[PDB]
Design a protein around this nucleic acid. Structure first.
Ligand code: NA
Ligand code: NA
Length: 327
DNA sequence: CCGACGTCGCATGAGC
DNA sequence: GCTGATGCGA
DNA sequence: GTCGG
């Protein structure tokens, strides 16, 4: 619903969330504030009091108090104070650079490094990932229009097939669900020659070809099963250059591919709902396999999966389009 | 009261 | 130089 | 910070 409903509250909780991750380094508190921010962001009424919000799952006593304070005063004293905190706001800011987490950011600010320009003056203290993150700080914070994602998909699917026409490639994430914009490109890759009960170069040569035609421009990380890096659409001649994007490519065993596609398609809320059905039906679904319990709860061997629908079939639920997997 | 809160590949440091 | 923990991102 | 065993 309209941000004007409870935007101040959700923004406040989101701010508090970020400080718990990046500054307090308390990851579970961060997820709590986000869970509260989300359940409120889906609430179709302008909240009148903290008690009204406390009814919602994810909102407890402390946030109810904070909502009371915000509603009455228009702000939150603890948030206002940490905003002005030069050390804390600087630590929180540096973590926006990909590769710089809470630990690196605190180390930087300790030794007087607070800003992007500070990072620029100090390259030899940055690792390879962080340098890329610094290099593309702005572009990485931009979202990717679906039209560009399609143009990116065209290039990925084409070069992948050109390497070996037996490769199977699927762009997952919210893009596969039909989102009008994406944050990055998540590619899932497989080959009939690759199963669980069974080359080290299946991933390399796909990455290699995408570098060869200058789609992939940088590499954050690269192993035998997982690639994380940077890509860029070809500049339409004299038209303004496209922003560099984040792209992940992972090689999954064929017998685990469709459990992988299902999981990385999402949504998170949908996955939660989905593998909670499965439990009530005697099956355990994770990222890799679907397995059966189990009179006492001993999970048996992974069931054969040749498609997404195959998984739906096991747990007696009808196949639902990626379009309709918001929850 | 008090533990769970996802899990893991890769890069990198520490430990030895 | 080998083993394993840590930081990071997803 | 919240939930739940
Ligand atoms: Na609640
Ligand atoms: Na970061």
């Amino acid at each position: 619903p309209q941000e004007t409903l409870n935007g101040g509250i959700t923004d406040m909780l989101t701010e508090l969330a970020n400080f718990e991750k990046n500054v307090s380094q308390a990851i579970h508190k961060y997820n709590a504030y986000r869970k509260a921010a989300s359940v409120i962001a889906k609430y179709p009424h302008k909240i009148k009091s903290g008690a009204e919000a406390k009814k919602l799952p994810g909102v407890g006593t402390k946030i109810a108090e904070k909502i009371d304070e915000f509603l009455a005063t228009g702000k939150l004293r603890k948030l206002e104070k940490i905003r002005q905190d030069d050390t804390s706001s600087s630590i929180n800011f540096l973590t926006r650079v990909s590769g710089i987490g809470p630990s690196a950011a605190r180390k930087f600010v300790d030794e007087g490094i607070k800003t992007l320009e500070d990072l620029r003056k100090n390259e030899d203290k940055l690792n390879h990932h962080q340098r890329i993150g610094l290099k593309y700080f702005g572009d990485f914070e931009k979202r990717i229009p679906r039209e560009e994602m399609l143009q990116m998909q065209d290039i990925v699917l084409n070069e992948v097939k050109k390497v070996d026409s037996e490769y199977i490639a699927t762009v997952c994430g919210s893009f596969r669900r039909g989102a009008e914009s994406s944050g990055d490109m998540d590619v899932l890759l497989t080959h009939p020659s690759f199963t669980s009960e069974s080359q080290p170069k299946l991933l390399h040569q796909v990455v290699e070809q995408l570098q060869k035609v200058h789609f992939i421009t940088d590499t954050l990380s690269k192993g035998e099963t997982k690639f994380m890096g940077v890509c860029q659409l070809p500049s339409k001649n004299d038209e303004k250059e496209y922003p560099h994007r984040r792209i992940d490519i992972r090689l999954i065993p064929k017998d685990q591919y469709y459990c992988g596609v299902l999981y990385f398609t999402g949504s998170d809320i949908f996955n939660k709902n989905m593998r909670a059905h499965a439990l009530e039906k005697g099956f355990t679904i994770n990222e890799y396999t679907i397995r059966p319990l189990g009179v006492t709860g001993v999970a048996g061997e992974p069931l054969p999966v040749d498609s997404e629908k195959d998984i739906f079939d096991y747990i007696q639920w009808k196949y639902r389009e990626p379009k309709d997997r918001s929850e």
